[PDB]
Design an enzyme around this catalytic site. Sequence first.
Site, PDB file in Angstrom:
ATOM      1  N   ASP A 194     -35.604  23.117  52.140  1.00  0.00           N
ATOM      2  CA  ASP A 194     -36.277  24.424  52.128  1.00  0.00           C
ATOM      3  C   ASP A 194     -37.910  24.336  51.294  1.00  0.00           C
ATOM      4  OD1 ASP A 194     -33.955  26.160  50.929  1.00  0.00           O
ATOM      5  OD2 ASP A 194     -34.358  26.052  48.821  1.00  0.00           O
ATOM      6  N   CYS A 230     -34.965  32.467  63.784  1.00  0.00           N
ATOM      7  CA  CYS A 230     -35.547  31.850  62.587  1.00  0.00           C
ATOM      8  C   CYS A 230     -36.586  33.079  61.166  1.00  0.00           C
ATOM      9  CB  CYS A 230     -36.296  30.446  61.829  1.00  0.00           C
ATOM     10  SG  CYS A 230     -37.802  30.707  63.530  1.00  0.00           S
ATOM     11  N   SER A 231     -36.432  33.223  60.447  1.00  0.00           N
ATOM     12  CA  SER A 231     -37.115  34.405  59.604  1.00  0.00           C
ATOM     13  C   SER A 231     -38.276  34.497  60.918  1.00  0.00           C
ATOM     14  CB  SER A 231     -37.728  34.013  59.012  1.00  0.00           C
ATOM     15  OG  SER A 231     -38.942  32.954  59.222  1.00  0.00           O
ATOM     16  N   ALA A 232     -38.843  34.308  61.293  1.00  0.00           N
ATOM     17  CA  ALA A 232     -40.344  34.478  62.017  1.00  0.00           C
ATOM     18  C   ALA A 232     -39.735  34.387  63.263  1.00  0.00           C
ATOM     19  CB  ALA A 232     -41.558  34.748  61.732  1.00  0.00           C
ATOM     20  N   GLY A 233     -39.097  33.649  64.022  1.00  0.00           N
ATOM     21  CA  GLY A 233     -39.290  33.434  65.357  1.00  0.00           C
ATOM     22  C   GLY A 233     -39.857  32.451  65.736  1.00  0.00           C
ATOM     23  N   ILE A 234     -40.554  31.452  65.038  1.00  0.00           N
ATOM     24  CA  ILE A 234     -41.868  30.714  65.808  1.00  0.00           C
ATOM     25  C   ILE A 234     -41.464  28.958  65.255  1.00  0.00           C
ATOM     26  CG2 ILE A 234     -43.272  32.641  65.898  1.00  0.00           C
ATOM     27  CD1 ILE A 234     -44.526  32.193  63.676  1.00  0.00           C
ATOM     28  N   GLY A 235     -41.557  29.184  63.784  1.00  0.00           N
ATOM     29  CA  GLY A 235     -41.531  27.589  63.125  1.00  0.00           C
ATOM     30  C   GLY A 235     -40.671  26.772  64.013  1.00  0.00           C
ATOM     31  N   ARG A 236     -39.774  26.819  63.105  1.00  0.00           N
ATOM     32  CA  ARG A 236     -38.075  26.056  63.441  1.00  0.00           C
ATOM     33  C   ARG A 236     -38.078  26.787  64.974  1.00  0.00           C
ATOM     34  NH1 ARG A 236     -34.792  26.966  57.673  1.00  0.00           N
ATOM     35  NH2 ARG A 236     -36.722  27.226  56.052  1.00  0.00           N
ATOM     36  N   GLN A 274     -45.684  26.734  63.549  1.00  0.00           N
ATOM     37  CA  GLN A 274     -46.143  27.708  62.010  1.00  0.00           C
ATOM     38  C   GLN A 274     -46.867  26.411  61.430  1.00  0.00           C
ATOM     39  OE1 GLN A 274     -47.291  29.767  62.788  1.00  0.00           O
ATOM     40  NE2 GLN A 274     -48.039  30.325  61.135  1.00  0.00           N
TER      41      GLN A 274
HETATM   42  C1  A89 Z   1     -50.885  38.958  56.218  1.00  0.00           C
HETATM   43  C2  A89 Z   1     -49.431  38.821  56.644  1.00  0.00           C
HETATM   44  C3  A89 Z   1     -48.772  37.719  56.130  1.00  0.00           C
HETATM   45  C4  A89 Z   1     -47.230  38.020  55.963  1.00  0.00           C
HETATM   46  C5  A89 Z   1     -46.224  36.263  56.282  1.00  0.00           C
HETATM   47  O1  A89 Z   1     -46.225  36.046  55.053  1.00  0.00           O
HETATM   48  N1  A89 Z   1     -45.861  36.180  57.328  1.00  0.00           N
HETATM   49  C6  A89 Z   1     -46.026  34.755  57.195  1.00  0.00           C
HETATM   50  C7  A89 Z   1     -45.147  34.940  58.737  1.00  0.00           C
HETATM   51  C8  A89 Z   1     -43.922  33.656  59.030  1.00  0.00           C
HETATM   52  C9  A89 Z   1     -44.124  32.794  59.960  1.00  0.00           C
HETATM   53  C10 A89 Z   1     -43.043  31.412  60.061  1.00  0.00           C
HETATM   54  C11 A89 Z   1     -42.149  31.340  59.108  1.00  0.00           C
HETATM   55  C12 A89 Z   1     -41.309  30.012  59.821  1.00  0.00           C
HETATM   56  F1  A89 Z   1     -42.189  28.661  60.144  1.00  0.00           F
HETATM   57  F2  A89 Z   1     -40.873  29.501  58.314  1.00  0.00           F
HETATM   58  P1  A89 Z   1     -39.893  30.455  60.991  1.00  0.00           P
HETATM   59  O2  A89 Z   1     -39.476  28.740  60.991  1.00  0.00           O
HETATM   60  O3  A89 Z   1     -38.914  31.104  60.223  1.00  0.00           O
HETATM   61  O4  A89 Z   1     -40.877  30.713  62.301  1.00  0.00           O
HETATM   62  C13 A89 Z   1     -42.079  32.306  58.041  1.00  0.00           C
HETATM   63  C14 A89 Z   1     -42.663  33.521  58.374  1.00  0.00           C
HETATM   64  C15 A89 Z   1     -46.834  33.671  57.751  1.00  0.00           C
HETATM   65  O5  A89 Z   1     -46.660  32.428  57.195  1.00  0.00           O
HETATM   66  N2  A89 Z   1     -48.036  33.725  58.508  1.00  0.00           N
HETATM   67  C16 A89 Z   1     -48.106  32.965  59.518  1.00  0.00           C
HETATM   68  C17 A89 Z   1     -48.822  33.263  60.381  1.00  0.00           C
HETATM   69  C18 A89 Z   1     -48.410  32.482  62.215  1.00  0.00           C
HETATM   70  C19 A89 Z   1     -49.672  33.023  62.497  1.00  0.00           C
HETATM   71  N3  A89 Z   1     -50.801  34.397  62.622  1.00  0.00           N
HETATM   72  C20 A89 Z   1     -51.797  35.554  63.252  1.00  0.00           C
HETATM   73  O6  A89 Z   1     -52.342  34.380  62.444  1.00  0.00           O
HETATM   74  C21 A89 Z   1     -52.253  36.154  63.546  1.00  0.00           C
HETATM   75  C22 A89 Z   1     -51.431  37.373  64.022  1.00  0.00           C
HETATM   76  C23 A89 Z   1     -51.138  38.545  64.410  1.00  0.00           C
HETATM   77  C24 A89 Z   1     -52.494  38.445  65.280  1.00  0.00           C
HETATM   78  C25 A89 Z   1     -52.963  36.917  65.906  1.00  0.00           C
HETATM   79  I1  A89 Z   1     -55.166  36.597  67.442  1.00  0.00           I
HETATM   80  C26 A89 Z   1     -52.739  36.060  64.767  1.00  0.00           C
HETATM   81  C27 A89 Z   1     -49.084  31.940  59.336  1.00  0.00           C
HETATM   82  N4  A89 Z   1     -50.461  32.365  58.694  1.00  0.00           N
HETATM   83  O7  A89 Z   1     -49.627  30.607  57.970  1.00  0.00           O
HETATM   84  C28 A89 Z   1     -46.732  39.193  56.007  1.00  0.00           C
HETATM   85  C29 A89 Z   1     -47.210  40.391  56.330  1.00  0.00           C
HETATM   86  C30 A89 Z   1     -48.503  40.074  56.119  1.00  0.00           C
HETATM   87 BR1  A89 Z   1     -49.581  41.958  56.253  1.00  0.00          BR
END
Ligand code: A89
Length: 298
Positions: A194, A230-236, A274
Amino acid sequence: SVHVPGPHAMTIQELVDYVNARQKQGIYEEYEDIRRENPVGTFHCSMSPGNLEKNRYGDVPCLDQTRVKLTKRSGHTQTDYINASFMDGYKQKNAYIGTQGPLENTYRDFWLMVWEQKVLVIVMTTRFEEGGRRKCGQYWPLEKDSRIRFGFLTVTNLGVENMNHYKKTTLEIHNTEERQKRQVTHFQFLSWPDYGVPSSAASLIDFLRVVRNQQSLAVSNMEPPIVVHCSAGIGRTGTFCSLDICLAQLEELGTLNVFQTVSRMRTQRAFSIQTPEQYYFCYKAILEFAEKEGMVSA
Ligand SMILES: Cc1cc(C(=O)N[C@@H](Cc2ccc(C(F)(F)P(=O)(O)O)cc2)C(=O)N[C@@H](CCCNC(=O)c2cccc(I)c2)C(N)=O)ccc1Br
């Protein structure tokens, strides 16, 4: 494929020094250098009208250049959009489709994509909820014999098997519009913490081998991409795919390059990897595998 060996591939010996010379904080900075890079591509489709509601996170759109298009139809309140990206694998185009955890309003889109892309294996690396944070909807029939209907597509559970670090479910997808059936294997990795990253990569790599074998066997009996989410499809997702690619290169030529693999992957599935912990995990996992294979002399 963007994932070719080299230029500048690294051996395990060279990898050891590279990591020693940098340490944890060093690798962490290397991740920030990548994160600082301006994404290569655009995100207009993902942020356009009608597709916004299809994204689990407003801050995680997918690239226009590599998005998976759904072969939809005319006037029926719907788009061809799904937050999913085609991702190359080691010397293989479109080895995977990295996507977010399905939302109730996109379950049908997810299965349509699975059908149209002829997917045989699905890899899920999260639970539905973790730490109070929702990560994925229940998009598939959980117990044996139960089925769910998504328009002209029916999905039925043919059996479930619980392993120590993962769960395997066999699903049958019935496309009633084309009168065809297909078996898909669904794997849910259960050992991702977690908080943070796995303390040992042994479970994840063994799981990777399970998935590879099933894909190989399914393809043999039917290459289609493996859906990984995974949730966002980028980390895991990015971590799973990057390790698969590095390990592949390591088995074929005895070399690899984490920096290249992740940077290259980020041009197909934007934002892959991520956190610096996950980036560092990619290095540590490879070194842990090297030691376990008796390749490391300290
Ligand atoms: C401002 C905002 C944030 C989120 C959010 O909570 N985002 C999460 C989404 C997320 C990402 C990864 C995971 C994970 F790693 F666990 P996974 O294994 O399931 O994939 C879970 C959840 C986050 O941490 N946000 C990230 C954002 C990633 C980078 N984006 C940008 O920043 C970005 C966006 C748009 C355009 C451009 I250029 C860049 C963060 N902030 O670390 C949602 C809505 C809004 Br509006």
